[PDB]
Structures are given as structure tokens and as C-alpha cells.
Amino acid sequence: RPTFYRQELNKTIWEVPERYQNLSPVGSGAYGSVCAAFDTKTGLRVAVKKLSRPFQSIIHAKRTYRELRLLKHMKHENVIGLLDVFTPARSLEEFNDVYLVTHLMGADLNNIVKCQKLTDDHVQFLIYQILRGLKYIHSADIIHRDLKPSNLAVNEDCELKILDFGLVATRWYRAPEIMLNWMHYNQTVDIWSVGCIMAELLTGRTLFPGTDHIDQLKLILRLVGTPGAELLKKISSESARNYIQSLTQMPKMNFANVFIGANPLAVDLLEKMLVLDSDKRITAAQALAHAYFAQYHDPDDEPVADPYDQSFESRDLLIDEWKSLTYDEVISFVPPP
Amino acid sequence: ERPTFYRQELNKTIWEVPERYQNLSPVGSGAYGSVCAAFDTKTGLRVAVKKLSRPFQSIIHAKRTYRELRLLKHMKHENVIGLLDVFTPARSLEEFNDVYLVTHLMGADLNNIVKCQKLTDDHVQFLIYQILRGLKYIHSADIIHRDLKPSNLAVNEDCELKILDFGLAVATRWYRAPEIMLNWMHYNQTVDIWSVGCIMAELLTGRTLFPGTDHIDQLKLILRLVGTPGAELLKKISSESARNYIQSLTQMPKMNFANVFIGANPLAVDLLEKMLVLDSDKRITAAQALAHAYFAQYHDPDDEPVADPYDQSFESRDLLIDEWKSLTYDEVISFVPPP
Numbered sequence: 192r193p194t195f196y197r198q199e200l201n202k203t204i205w206e207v208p209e210r211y212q213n214l215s216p217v218g219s220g221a222y223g224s225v226c227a228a229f230d231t232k233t234g235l236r237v238a239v240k241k242l243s244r245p246f247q248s249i250i251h252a253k254r255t256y257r258e259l260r261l262l263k264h265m266k267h268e269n270v271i272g273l274l275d276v277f278t279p280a281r282s283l284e285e286f287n288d289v290y291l292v293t294h295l296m297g298a299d300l301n302n303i304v305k306c307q308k309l310t311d312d313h314v315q316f317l318i319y320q321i322l323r324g325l326k327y328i329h330s331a332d333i334i335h336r337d338l339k340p341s342n343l344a345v346n347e348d349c350e351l352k353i354l355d356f357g358l359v360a361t362r363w364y365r366a367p368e369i370m371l372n373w374m375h376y377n378q379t380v381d382i383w384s385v386g387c388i389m390a391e392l393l394t395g396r397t398l399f400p401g402t403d404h405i406d407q408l409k410l411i412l413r414l415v416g417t418p419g420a421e422l423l424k425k426i427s428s429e430s431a432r433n434y435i436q437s438l439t440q441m442p443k444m445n446f447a448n449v450f451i452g453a454n455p456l457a458v459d460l461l462e463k464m465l466v467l468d469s470d471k472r473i474t475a476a477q478a479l480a481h482a483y484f485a486q487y488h489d490p491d492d493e494p495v496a497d498p499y500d501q502s503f504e505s506r507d508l509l510i511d512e513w514k515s516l517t518y519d520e521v522i523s524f525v526p527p528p
Numbered sequence: 529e530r531p532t533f534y535r536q537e538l539n540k541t542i543w544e545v546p547e548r549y550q551n552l553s554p555v556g557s558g559a560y561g562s563v564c565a566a567f568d569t570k571t572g573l574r575v576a577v578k579k580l581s582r583p584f585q586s587i588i589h590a591k592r593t594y595r596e597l598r599l600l601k602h603m604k605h606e607n608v609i610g611l612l613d614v615f616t617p618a619r620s621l622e623e624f625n626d627v628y629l630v631t632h633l634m635g636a637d638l639n640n641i642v643k644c645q646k647l648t649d650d651h652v653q654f655l656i657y658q659i660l661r662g663l664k665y666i667h668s669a670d671i672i673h674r675d676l677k678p679s680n681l682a683v684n685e686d687c688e689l690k691i692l693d694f695g696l697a698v699a700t701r702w703y704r705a706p707e708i709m710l711n712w713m714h715y716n717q718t719v720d721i722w723s724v725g726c727i728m729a730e731l732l733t734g735r736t737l738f739p740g741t742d743h744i745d746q747l748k749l750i751l752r753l754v755g756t757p758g759a760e761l762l763k764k765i766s767s768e769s770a771r772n773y774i775q776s777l778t779q780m781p782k783m784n785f786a787n788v789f790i791g792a793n794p795l796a797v798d799l800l801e802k803m804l805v806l807d808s809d810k811r812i813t814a815a816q817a818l819a820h821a822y823f824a825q826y827h828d829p830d831d832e833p834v835a836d837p838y839d840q841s842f843e844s845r846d847l848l849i850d851e852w853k854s855l856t857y858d859e860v861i862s863f864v865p866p867p
């Protein structure tokens with residue numbers, strides 16, 4: 192049980208153990224605020240996320256538990272891990288604030304696509320690592336839903352980690368079914384995003400730079416073509432089917448022609464990721480075994496999540512219970528080596 | 529007059545090297561590069577061949593590649609690693625993507641030794657003399673090693689020592705100067721003298737001086753020996769919160785080192801006192817240490833050379849990857865082997 196100190200930073204109170212020094216705001220919003228800090232115990236730069244109003248709404252209370260529980264179980268080279276979690280509170284009664292701590296990310300993938308023309312091997316290595324972390328995330332029944340270059344931390348050695356930085360437009364990497372307000376969607380949405388990211392690493396530019404969601408969808412159909420009869424058989428929404436069925440047919444462009452400078456294996460993989468029908472998209476685990484990643488793929492070193500349930504929508508509790516569940520997860524936390 | 533190259537794969541790694549280098553076997557690997565031991569048929573020497581990893585894949589890697597080549601091309605001293613050769617398979621700048629560095633193959637490091645024998649005082653004399661002689665040279669080129677530790681000091685069968693950097697990816701923190709762990713933003717050469725003091729102590733006692741489990745523990749262990757900061761030193765810390773923090777600790781006196789290192793040569797103890805001072809401005813320098821009576825058997829003021837002027841101006845430049853690559857290529861092409 193450390194000694195805590197108290198400061199204000201941009202109209203928010205930060206109560207943090209002595210071990211973290213030189214707290215410097217690096218971002219804030221309705222989900223949390225983050226400070227970069229110096230971890231005196233380790234000498235590493237850390238990010239300290241203070242969650243915003245964690246128990247003031249039921250949805251906040253729930254988000255608070257979901258994030259801590261998830262992050263406590265994320266133990267993979269290509270996924271953000273939890274270095275520390277704390278609270279200034281000394282008991283459950285006083286418990287109203289939670290702080291999450293991770294390795295500070297310097298650079299993201301967007302910092303990289305804006306600095307240089309990537310070689311093929313550099314694209315192989317980056318997309319390999321995305322797919323490796325995603326295979327692990329998906330095996331826990333988690334969908335990322337916002338994969339984009341700014342949520343992908345890349346160090347000096349091109350070692351990549353998936354985070355969620357939310358506190359380069361999201362719409363640009365987003366699966367069409369999300370933009371269409373689909374009833375359910377699944378983890379295949381994130382494969383669409385990876386397709387958009389890989390394209391951009393291959394050409395240097397945003398694949399579908401839409402100005403709004405409808406422009407976005409227009410650009411997508413232009414490349415991949417209008418839905419086929421097989422896909423239409425699976426659209427539940429009458430008004431959607433009506434609209435989609437009105438459109439003039441658009442053919443699928445030849446990707447080998449679009450991406451004329453790219454490795455044909457890279458082109459082949461993009462064709463398997465950027466498919467309208469999400470059921471026909473390649474999965475993260477299947478994409479790892481694609482020839483494009485032959486120099487990187489190791490089926491005995493592409494691990495999957497631990498057995499804890501991370502997908503528990505059914506639980507309909509009250510703020511107080513989500514609160515004590517969270518409090519227990521904080522107290523039981525064991526730091527990584 | 530380009531050599532003929534042969535290709536092979538060692539550990540998912542392609543090694544393309546001139547025929548002169550035979551019998552490659554991998555001896556180390558990591559994020560910075562991979563190393564193979566080899567036999568240089570031209571010279572009859574065993575060599576180490578280090579293939580840099582992803583040399584031009586990032587701006588940071590590109591500048592590291594250049595930095596390492598420049599530094600190794602400069603180092604011409606008996607107690608410091610020298611460059612025997614540098615090569616690339618590339619025939620032009622437009623082909624240039626791989627860099628290989630060749631040095632004399634080192635047998636053991638100093639760490640292998642301390643574990644394996646209790647060292648005589650003449651033995652510690654010789655090893656520490658050679659570290660300071662190399663350090664005097666490195667420091668004279670305005671280079672700071674920053675990671676001096678037994679695993680970065682190679683020692684042959686004749687007890688001849690070279691400083692290098694074996695790192696490719698025994699804790700560094702154990703030999704690290706207290707100000708580096710305090711995040712002092714403008715540290716200087718004297719950090720390496722701290723490290724030498726820690727290494728000498730270990731050679732005398734046979735055990736790590738300050739085996740800290742983290743940065744805080746490390747500092748605790750250091751203060752148990754050297755004492756909590758004096759009034760002189762506290763005044764050099766301009767942070768009120770830092771000052772008050774240190775003052776609220778249980779105050780530790782300085783231990784008398786002669787009372788700590790039992791049975792050691794009194795001269796070695798005196799030298800260690802001069803190296804392990806908390807205030808870096810008060811530490812002995814490498815040049816000064818060489819003249820300490822501890823090394824009277826070894827010291828020769830006419831055989832402790834300094835480096836030719838070293839142009840480090842690149843460090844302060846922010847350049848493109850293909851610019852760093854082109855500059856590295858110039859240095860590959862201009863390399864002249866040592867006779």
C-alpha cells in the first residue's frame with residue numbers, strides 16, 4: 192500500500208502513488224484521461240489512464256469492470272498489457288476512482304506510413320503482428336471494432352501492439368455492415384479494417400478516404416462491386432435490401448491492377464479480407480497461414496486467450512455490484528514480472 | 529576487386545558473406561542483430577560477424593546503423609573493439625539493404641571469469657587498468673559507453689581486455705550510476721566511472737556490489753554504502769519535493785570502504801573510494817585513475833593514447849531513412865581494413 196500524492200491537471204484531480212512521477216497529460220475525454228509518467232521503480236515511461244466517472248452511470252460502471260477484467264487477462268506480445276492498476280481508496284466504501292497503467296506508446300503505425308515508403312517485408316512483419324494479436328483477441332470472443340493505424344503502437348524495432356487509444360478517421364477502416372447498422376456483427380469486421388490498413392501500407396495512402404458514411408460506402412462498392420445474389424439472401428432489413436437492390440450494378444475491380452506495385456501474394460490476401468460478405472472474409476487464424484506470411488508464421492507461437500469469459504452481455508446488475516466486482520479485481524491484481 | 533559471396537540460411541536468417549569467411553555458426557541473436565563465429569581464411573583469425581537486423585526499416589534503425597558503423601570505424605585502441613571488416617552483398621546504393629560488421633572473435637567476457645576464479649590482486653590490477661585505458665580513449669572522443677558491465681568486457685586467455693557492446697536485444701541496473709536512474713537529463717562521462725567502480729568491487733569480493741531488484745532497491749543499496757546525500761550535493765538538486773523527500777528518509781552515513789572490502793589492497797580501496805562518489809563532479813576520471821598508485825606496475829603515461837577527433841555532428845541531425853542509408857553506404861565503401 193503506497194504513499195499517494197495529489198495534483199490537478201487540466202481541471203481533473205490526479206491521485207497517484209509516489210512511484211509515478213512527472214505526470215504529463217497526453218489526452219482526455221468522456222472515457223478517461225491519460226498522463227505520460229516516469230515509473231521510478233522501473234525507469235520506463237508509462238501511460239496512466241484515469242477512468243472518467245467510472246460509477247456515475249450503469250453503462251460506465253459496466254465499462255469500468257469490462258476494461259479492467261479484460262486488460263488483466265491480456266497477456267500477449269502484440270496486445271497492450273496491464274503494468275499496474277490502483278485506486279486512492281482504502282476500502283470499498285471510499286472506492287470511486289480507478290487508474291490503469293501500461294507501457295507508454297511513443298509512435299503509432301500512422302507515424303510510420305507518414306514517414307516512409309514501406310518495403311514488402313516491412314508490410315509482411317507489421318500485418319503479421321496485427322493478425323497475431325487479433326487471433327488472440329478474437330479467441331476471447333472480443334471484437335476490437337475500431338482498428339485503425341492510430342490504435343496500433345509500433346516501437347523502434349517495428350514491434351507492434353494493439354491498444355484502444357479512444358478517450359485518421361475511424362470511418363475509413365470500418366466494415367460496411369457497421370455503417371449500415373447491422374443487427375449483429377462479428378469479429379470479421381476487424382479483418383475488414385486490417386484489409387484497409389494493409390492496402391494503405393502497400394500504397395502509402397488511405398484506401399477509402401470517405402467524407403461521410405455514405406461517401407465511404409460509395410468508395411467501397413466502387414472497388415469491391417455491388418452485393419451478389421448470395422449476399423442479398425442474408426439481408427434481414429427490408430428497407431436496406433430495397434435500397435441496395437435499387438443500385439446500378441458495379442463490377443469488382445481487379446485488385447492486381449489497382450495495387451500494381453504490390454507482391455501478388457499481398458494482392459491475394461487483400462482480396463480475401465476486403466469482401467462485402469463478412470462470412471466469406473478470411474479469419475485472423477487463417478490469414479496467419481497464408482503464403483504471404485511464410486517467413487513469419489509459427490503455428491506453435493500464435494497463442495490464444497485464457498479461459499475467462501470476456502463476453503458477458505447477459506449480466507444485468509446494479510452500479511453497486513459492478514463496483515464491488517471491479518474493487519475485487521483491483522485488490523487481486525498481480526503485477527507482471 | 530569485389531569478393532565473391534556465398535549464401536546460406538542460419539536460423540531463419542540469410543547470411544550472405546564473402547567466401548573468405550568460413551565455418552559460420554550462430555553465437556547470438558536479437559532485435560539489434562545476429563552474430564556468427566567464423567574463420568577468416570585471409571588472416572587465419574577467428575572472427576565475429578554481426579548482421580544488423582532491419583538496418584534501414586525505421587529512422588531510428590537507420591541512424592543506429594550509421595552510428596554503430598561510424599563509431600566502430602573510429603575505434604583504434606588495444607582495449608576497445610576494432611572493426612576488421614564491414615561489407616554488404618549490395619553492388620550499388622539502390623541494392624543496399626544489409627550491413628555486416630566483422631571483429632576479432634571474443635572468447636569469454638569478464639562475467640565468465642569472476643564466477644570461475646577468485647582473482648589475485650595483480651589480476652584485478654591488470655583487468656581494471658585495461659578497462660580505464662580503453663575508457664580514457666573512448667572518453668577522449670566524447671563518447672559515453674553508458675552500459676559498462678562485465679558482460680560487455682571481453683577477456684582472452686592472456687587476460688587481455690577489450691571494451692565492446694555485446695548487446696543484441698546480469699542486470700545493467702546493478703552497474704548503473706545513481707543519476708541515470710534518477711533521470712538526470714544531462715548526464716556525462718562520469719557515469720562510466722561509477723560502473724567501473726562497481727566492476728572493480730565485484731572483482732575484489734567475488735560478488736555483485738549492488739544487486740538491486742529494481743531502481744528503487746538499487747538506490748537503497750547504493751545509499752547503504754555511500755550514504756544519503758550531503759548538504760553540498762542536496763544543493764545541486766533544484767527540486768524542493770526531491771530535497772524534502774531525501775531528507776525524510778532514514779539518514780545513512782557513509783561507510784568507510786576500508787572497513788567494507790576486507791583484505792583488499794589498501795590502494796584498491798582508496799581507488800574505489802574515488803570512483804564510487806555520489807556526486808559525479810567529485811569522481812576520479814579515467815585519465816586520473818590510470819595514475820593512481822594502484823596501477824604503478826602498469827601505468828605508462830606515454831602508452832595511454834587518446835582518440836583522433838571524432839565528428840559526432842550527425843547525432844544532432846534529423847534526416848530521412850535513405851539519407852542515413854546513403855551515408856552508411858559511403859562509410860562501407862570508404863572502409864580501409866587495419867594492417
Ligand SMILES: Cc1ccc(-n2nc(C(C)(C)C)cc2NC(=O)Nc2cccc(Nc3ncnc4ccc(N)cc34)c2)cc1
Nearest residue numbers: 217218225238240254257258291293294295296353354355
Ligand atoms: C470499456 C473498454 C474495454 C476495453 C478496452 N480496451 N480494449 C483493448 C483491446 C481490445 C485492444 C485489448 C484495450 C482497451 N483498453 C486500453 O487500451 N486501455 C488503456 C489503458 C491504459 C492506457 C491507455 N492508453 C495509452 N497507453 C500507452 N500509451 C499511450 C499514449 C498516448 C495515449 N493517448 C494513450 C496511451 C489505454 C477499452 C474500453
Ligand SMILES: Cc1ccc(-n2nc(C(C)(C)C)cc2NC(=O)Nc2cccc(Nc3ncnc4ccc(N)cc34)c2)cc1
Nearest residue numbers: 555556563576578592595596629631632633634691692693
Ligand atoms: C547502435 C550501436 C552503436 C554502438 C555500439 N557499440 N559501441 C561500442 C563501444 C562504445 C564499445 C565502442 C561498441 C559497439 N558495438 C559493437 O561492439 N558491435 C559489435 C560488432 C561486431 C561483433 C560484436 N560482437 C562480438 N564480437 C566479438 N566476439 C563476439 C563473440 C560472441 C558474441 N555473441 C558477439 C561477439 C559486436 C553498439 C550499438
Ligand SMILES: CCCCCCCCO[C@@H]1O[C@H](CO)[C@@H](O)[C@H](O)[C@H]1O
Nearest residue numbers: 367368375376377425467468469470
Ligand atoms: C451497400 C453495401 C452492402 C453491405 C453488405 C455488408 C454484408 C455484411 O456481411 C454480413 O455480415 C452479417 C453481420 O456480421 C452476417 O450475419 C451476414 O451473414 C453477412 O453476409
Ligand SMILES: CCCCCCCCO[C@@H]1O[C@H](CO)[C@@H](O)[C@H](O)[C@H]1O
Nearest residue numbers: 371405406428430431432433434435
Ligand atoms: C443499406 C442502405 C440503406 C441506407 C442508404 C441510404 C443512403 C442514401 O444515399 C444518400 O441519399 C440520397 C437520396 O436519398 C442520394 O442522392 C445520395 O447518394 C446520398 O446522399
Ligand SMILES: CCCCCCCCO[C@@H]1O[C@H](CO)[C@@H](O)[C@H](O)[C@H]1O
Nearest residue numbers: 710711712713764765766770773774
Ligand atoms: C529520491 C528523490 C529523487 C531525486 C531527484 C533528482 C532529480 C534531479 O534532476 C535534475 O536536477 C538538476 C537540478 O538543478 C537539473 O539541472 C536537471 O535538469 C534535472 O534533470
Ligand SMILES: CCCCCCCCO[C@@H]1O[C@H](CO)[C@@H](O)[C@H](O)[C@H]1O
Nearest residue numbers: 706707712714715716806807808809
Ligand atoms: C537519491 C540519491 C541521490 C543521488 C545523487 C546523484 C548525484 C549525481 O551527481 C550529479 O550528476 C549530474 C549529472 O551529470 C551533474 O550535473 C551534477 O553536477 C552532479 O552533482
